[PDB]
Design a protein around this motif. Structure first.
Motif, PDB file in Angstrom:
ATOM      1  N   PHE A  16       2.629   2.787  13.525  1.00 55.19           N
ATOM      2  CA  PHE A  16       2.363   1.557  12.788  1.00 55.19           C
ATOM      3  C   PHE A  16       1.804   0.475  13.700  1.00 55.19           C
ATOM      4  CE2 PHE A  16       2.975  -1.174   9.155  1.00 55.19           C
ATOM      5  CZ  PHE A  16       3.135  -2.427   9.712  1.00 55.19           C
ATOM      6  N   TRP A  17       2.411   0.294  14.872  1.00 58.62           N
ATOM      7  CA  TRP A  17       1.994  -0.792  15.745  1.00 58.62           C
ATOM      8  C   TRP A  17       0.755  -0.443  16.556  1.00 58.62           C
ATOM      9  CZ3 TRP A  17       3.476  -5.336  14.526  1.00 58.62           C
ATOM     10  CH2 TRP A  17       4.680  -5.495  13.825  1.00 58.62           C
ATOM     11  N   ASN A  18       0.504   0.841  16.819  1.00 58.53           N
ATOM     12  CA  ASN A  18      -0.820   1.238  17.289  1.00 58.53           C
ATOM     13  C   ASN A  18      -1.891   0.742  16.327  1.00 58.53           C
ATOM     14  OD1 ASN A  18      -0.109   2.619  19.688  1.00 58.53           O
ATOM     15  ND2 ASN A  18       0.423   4.464  18.530  1.00 58.53           N
ATOM     16  N   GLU A  59       0.824  -1.204   0.000  1.00 56.51           N
ATOM     17  CA  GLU A  59       0.000   0.000   0.000  1.00 56.51           C
ATOM     18  C   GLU A  59       0.862   1.259   0.000  1.00 56.51           C
ATOM     19  OE1 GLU A  59      -2.062   1.298   3.603  1.00 56.51           O
ATOM     20  OE2 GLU A  59      -3.953   1.188   2.492  1.00 56.51           O
ATOM     21  N   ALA A  60       1.959   1.251   0.759  1.00 51.62           N
ATOM     22  CA  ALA A  60       2.838   2.413   0.806  1.00 51.62           C
ATOM     23  C   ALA A  60       3.517   2.640  -0.537  1.00 51.62           C
ATOM     24  CB  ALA A  60       3.876   2.242   1.913  1.00 51.62           C
ATOM     25  N   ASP A  61       3.889   1.559  -1.225  1.00 53.00           N
ATOM     26  CA  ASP A  61       4.452   1.704  -2.562  1.00 53.00           C
ATOM     27  C   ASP A  61       3.434   2.306  -3.520  1.00 53.00           C
ATOM     28  OD1 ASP A  61       6.594   0.941  -4.691  1.00 53.00           O
ATOM     29  OD2 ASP A  61       4.734   0.047  -5.438  1.00 53.00           O
ATOM     30  N   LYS A  62       2.183   1.842  -3.457  1.00 49.65           N
ATOM     31  CA  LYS A  62       1.168   2.413  -4.338  1.00 49.65           C
ATOM     32  C   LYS A  62       0.898   3.878  -4.008  1.00 49.65           C
ATOM     33  CE  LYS A  62      -3.001   1.614  -6.836  1.00 49.65           C
ATOM     34  NZ  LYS A  62      -3.868   0.568  -7.440  1.00 49.65           N
ATOM     35  N   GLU A  63       0.949   4.247  -2.729  1.00 54.56           N
ATOM     36  CA  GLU A  63       0.726   5.631  -2.326  1.00 54.56           C
ATOM     37  C   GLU A  63       1.969   6.501  -2.446  1.00 54.56           C
ATOM     38  OE1 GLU A  63      -2.260   6.821  -1.876  1.00 54.56           O
ATOM     39  OE2 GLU A  63      -2.761   4.747  -2.405  1.00 54.56           O
ATOM     40  N   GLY A  64       3.121   5.921  -2.770  1.00 59.20           N
ATOM     41  CA  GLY A  64       4.340   6.697  -2.869  1.00 59.20           C
ATOM     42  C   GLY A  64       4.882   7.211  -1.556  1.00 59.20           C
ATOM     43  N   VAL A  65       4.501   6.604  -0.436  1.00 57.63           N
ATOM     44  CA  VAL A  65       4.951   7.045   0.876  1.00 57.63           C
ATOM     45  C   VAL A  65       5.916   6.015   1.450  1.00 57.63           C
ATOM     46  CG1 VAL A  65       2.805   8.308   1.242  1.00 57.63           C
ATOM     47  CG2 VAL A  65       3.055   5.995   2.159  1.00 57.63           C
ATOM     48  N   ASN A  80      12.587  -4.350   1.104  1.00 54.29           N
ATOM     49  CA  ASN A  80      11.857  -3.110   1.327  1.00 54.29           C
ATOM     50  C   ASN A  80      11.793  -2.696   2.792  1.00 54.29           C
ATOM     51  OD1 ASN A  80      10.832  -2.403  -1.480  1.00 54.29           O
ATOM     52  ND2 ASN A  80      10.109  -4.519  -1.276  1.00 54.29           N
ATOM     53  N   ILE A  81      12.577  -3.328   3.662  1.00 57.08           N
ATOM     54  CA  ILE A  81      12.705  -2.919   5.054  1.00 57.08           C
ATOM     55  C   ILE A  81      14.187  -2.845   5.386  1.00 57.08           C
ATOM     56  CG2 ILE A  81      12.134  -3.431   7.466  1.00 57.08           C
ATOM     57  CD1 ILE A  81       9.760  -5.059   6.391  1.00 57.08           C
ATOM     58  N   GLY A  82      14.564  -1.851   6.186  1.00 58.30           N
ATOM     59  CA  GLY A  82      15.935  -1.737   6.637  1.00 58.30           C
ATOM     60  C   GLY A  82      16.315  -2.872   7.564  1.00 58.30           C
ATOM     61  N   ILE A  83      16.824  -3.964   6.999  1.00 55.82           N
ATOM     62  CA  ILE A  83      17.193  -5.147   7.766  1.00 55.82           C
ATOM     63  C   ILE A  83      18.595  -5.561   7.349  1.00 55.82           C
ATOM     64  CG2 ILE A  83      16.670  -7.541   8.299  1.00 55.82           C
ATOM     65  CD1 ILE A  83      13.744  -6.943   7.799  1.00 55.82           C
ATOM     66  N   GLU A  84      19.530  -5.524   8.293  1.00 51.40           N
ATOM     67  CA  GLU A  84      20.912  -5.867   7.994  1.00 51.40           C
ATOM     68  C   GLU A  84      21.083  -7.376   7.895  1.00 51.40           C
ATOM     69  OE1 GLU A  84      23.392  -3.898  10.901  1.00 51.40           O
ATOM     70  OE2 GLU A  84      23.249  -2.036   9.743  1.00 51.40           O
ATOM     71  N   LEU A  86       6.991   3.644   4.438  1.00 56.58           N
ATOM     72  CA  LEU A  86       6.489   2.950   5.613  1.00 56.58           C
ATOM     73  C   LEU A  86       7.559   2.939   6.694  1.00 56.58           C
ATOM     74  CD1 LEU A  86       3.779   1.432   6.238  1.00 56.58           C
ATOM     75  CD2 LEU A  86       5.148  -0.667   6.057  1.00 56.58           C
ATOM     76  N   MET A  87       7.129   3.062   7.946  1.00 54.52           N
ATOM     77  CA  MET A  87       8.039   3.121   9.090  1.00 54.52           C
ATOM     78  C   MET A  87       7.612   2.095  10.131  1.00 54.52           C
ATOM     79  SD  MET A  87       8.861   7.162   9.234  1.00 54.52           S
ATOM     80  CE  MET A  87      10.583   6.677   9.227  1.00 54.52           C
TER      81      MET A  87
END
Ligand SMILES: [Cs+]
Ligand SMILES: [Cs+]
Ligand SMILES: [Cs+]
Ligand SMILES: [Cs+]
Ligand SMILES: [Cs+]
Ligand SMILES: [Cs+]
Ligand SMILES: [Cs+]
Ligand SMILES: [Cs+]
Lengths: 123, 121
Positions: free
Chosen positions: B40-42, B25-31, B85-89, B33-34
């Motif tokens: 997000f977790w709320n 959804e964030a990719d489609k909206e161009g935003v 697509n997530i900052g994961i080392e 995600l965090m």
DNA sequence: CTGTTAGGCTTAGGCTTAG
DNA sequence: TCTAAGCCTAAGCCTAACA
């Protein structure tokens, strides 16, 4: 995206910053300049002069949120602390007012905005 | 004595699928995600009626779920999408484990984040 | 008014202590 | 010479209203 590392503000950072602020306020009083340490221009100048590794916006936020509430516990001379409290506009709740009056042997006059109006060095 | 309850595999599966749908959804909206934030977790706790708090979920996701994503019972396509697509080392050991388990070749960047992968199937 | 300076969000990092 | 729930603070930066 970049994973950031974070470095804490040390007690020495606070000593250096507070002494810098005190001296600049004294000189500004002599020269008629009004400095605003809760702004960002002051900390632009501080970062340039001390060549700090931290940004000016970080310093401004930290000074406002951490340093100001802890000023009265700083390892500094009590006259310096009182001058800074009077000339910066730092809130002092009732309990902190009593604590300061007791540990510094002073008489505080704190307004309805909890800012320090005046003080008397009762020593 | 405060009793503590572990996160289950089901918790992780539902959370990761939620994160996947939100990433699409964030990719489609161009935003951007965090998922390492709190808002997000709320939203997640509200939607899924999970009994754990949002701050607990955020800490757990950042500290436990991300380093363990490669071991999830999910399709490797989804796992690699999430890694991309997530900052994961990904350290060298985990990179080799992924390449063996999924039969892929990983291109991992200088920040140890996944750049891309080639399917050797 | 553009600088000040309150207040929001992320998420890195700390504390307590159950497993 | 443990890991990590569970929750938290605050570094780091930002925005936005008010002056
Ligand atoms: Cs320095
Ligand atoms: Cs004041
Ligand atoms: Cs990535
Ligand atoms: Cs101004
Ligand atoms: Cs303001
Ligand atoms: Cs803490
Ligand atoms: Cs444990
Ligand atoms: Cs704001």
């Amino acid at each position: 995206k970049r994973i950031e590392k974070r470095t804490k503000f040390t007690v020495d950072d606070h000593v250096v910053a507070w002494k810098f602020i005190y001296e600049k306020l004294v000189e500004a009083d002599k020269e008629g300049v009004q400095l605003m340490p809760k702004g960002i221009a002051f900390w632009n100048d501080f970062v340039r002069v001390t060549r700090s590794s931290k940004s000016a916006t970080n310093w401004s936020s930290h000074f406002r949120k951490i340093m100001c509430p802890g000023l009265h516990e700083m390892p500094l001379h009590k006259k310096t602390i009182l001058y800074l409290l009077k000339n910066i506009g730092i809130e002092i709740d009732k309990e902190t007012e009593q604590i300061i009056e007791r540990k510094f042997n002073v008489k505080l006059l704190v307004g309805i905005d909890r800012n320090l109006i005046s003080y008397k060095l009762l020593d």
